[PDB]
Enzyme design. Structure first.
Site, mmCIF file in Angstrom:
data_model
loop_
_atom_site.group_PDB
_atom_site.id
_atom_site.type_symbol
_atom_site.label_atom_id
_atom_site.label_comp_id
_atom_site.label_asym_id
_atom_site.label_seq_id
_atom_site.Cartn_x
_atom_site.Cartn_y
_atom_site.Cartn_z
ATOM 1 N N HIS A 45 6.070 49.285 99.030
ATOM 2 C CA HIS A 45 4.978 50.253 98.948
ATOM 3 C C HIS A 45 3.907 49.979 100.009
ATOM 4 O O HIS A 45 3.137 50.866 100.355
ATOM 5 C CB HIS A 45 4.428 50.341 97.533
ATOM 6 C CG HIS A 45 3.427 49.289 97.180
ATOM 7 N ND1 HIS A 45 3.716 48.221 96.347
ATOM 8 C CD2 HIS A 45 2.115 49.177 97.496
ATOM 9 C CE1 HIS A 45 2.623 47.507 96.161
ATOM 10 N NE2 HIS A 45 1.632 48.066 96.839
ATOM 11 N N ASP A 93 10.791 47.231 94.779
ATOM 12 C CA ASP A 93 9.573 47.175 95.608
ATOM 13 C C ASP A 93 9.641 45.954 96.542
ATOM 14 O O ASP A 93 8.997 44.934 96.310
ATOM 15 C CB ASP A 93 8.303 47.196 94.768
ATOM 16 C CG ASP A 93 7.070 47.542 95.570
ATOM 17 O OD1 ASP A 93 5.969 47.479 94.987
ATOM 18 O OD2 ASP A 93 7.179 47.838 96.760
ATOM 19 N N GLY A 186 -4.675 44.956 97.778
ATOM 20 C CA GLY A 186 -4.675 44.127 98.953
ATOM 21 C C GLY A 186 -3.901 42.841 98.805
ATOM 22 O O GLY A 186 -3.659 42.167 99.801
ATOM 23 N N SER A 188 -0.874 43.028 97.215
ATOM 24 C CA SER A 188 0.503 43.520 97.166
ATOM 25 C C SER A 188 1.282 43.028 98.318
ATOM 26 O O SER A 188 0.777 42.871 99.431
ATOM 27 C CB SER A 188 0.559 45.016 97.196
ATOM 28 O OG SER A 188 0.082 45.506 95.957
ATOM 29 N N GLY A 189 2.524 42.683 98.053
ATOM 30 C CA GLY A 189 3.418 42.220 99.085
ATOM 31 C C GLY A 189 3.408 40.729 99.225
ATOM 32 O O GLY A 189 4.360 40.157 99.793
#
Ligand code: NA
Length: 240
Positions: A45, A93, A186, A188-189
């Protein structure tokens, strides 16, 4: 990260900052994990938008020269083929980014170690989330890399009705949910680092929090379970 503490600058050397070009500047948007000298693992995402991305390794303070940073462009983006951006709850994801150059390894820049395929953490396992995400719901990004201790919440509990119910899948890891500490926008990932047999490994890729807020009791941060994607990761790197 809400309810975090500042990380020491050499604690989490596989953490990266994924940034996009914003006018004459660059802006942090997501975290990631360096998994090869020229590959980063992040959330799908994070790379939905058609932006120009770069990765920063060796980053500690987004707003100051640390003297340790390496800046590299993203050359290729490989999103999981089952990813659907309007259904994050379905899973998948995860994305891999091939970097334009191979980075140099040092005490600030190291490959993240990944778990063995199929590994599932016992409930309440010790883990840390790291990132530069918002420090309060509807707040602002951290300047310096933050960490928060988020014990895992196993699938049986996480998928129960007062937690996430059906939204959490067995291809995810849940951690936290104490109402004080959490991931936030912020983050995420980025990685969830869990200590197993004496060694930290990256078990999660930060995926989502509640629409009600970041730190919400019984809404633990949800991560893609890296150990469900080991074959996918190896297949992408081998074919690129
Ligand atoms: Na910096």
């Amino acid at each position: 990260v809400v309810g975090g503490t500042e990380a020491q600058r050499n604690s989490w050397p596989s953490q990266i900052s994924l940034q996009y070009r914003s006018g004459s500047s660059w802006a942090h948007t997501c975290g990631g994990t360096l998994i090869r000298q020229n590959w980063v693992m992040t959330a799908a995402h994070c790379v939905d938008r058609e932006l120009t991305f770069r990765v920063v390794v060796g980053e500690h303070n987004l707003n100051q020269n640390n003297g340790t940073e390496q800046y590299v462009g993203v050359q290729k983006i490989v999103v999981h083929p089952y990813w659907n951006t309007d259904d994050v709850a379905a899973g998948y994801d995860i994305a891999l980014l091939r970097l334009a150059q191979s980075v140099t390894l040092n005490s600030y820049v190291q490959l993240g170690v990944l778990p063995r395929a199929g590994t599932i953490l016992a409930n309440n396992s010790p883990c840390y989330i790291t990132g530069w995400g918002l420090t309060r719901t509807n707040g602002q990004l951290a300047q310096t890399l933050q960490q928060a201790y988020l014990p895992t919440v196993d699938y049986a509990i996480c998928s129960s009705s007062s937690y996430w119910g059906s939204t959490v899948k067995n291809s995810m890891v849940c951690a936290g949910g104490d109402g004080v500490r959490s991931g936030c926008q912020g983050d995420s990932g980025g990685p969830l680092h869990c200590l197993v047999n004496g060694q930290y490994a990256v078990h999660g890729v930060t995926s989502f929090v509640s629409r009600l807020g970041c730190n919400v009791t019984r809404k633990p941060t949800v991560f893609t379970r890296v150990s469900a994607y080991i074959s996918w990761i190896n297949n992408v790197i081998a074919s690129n």
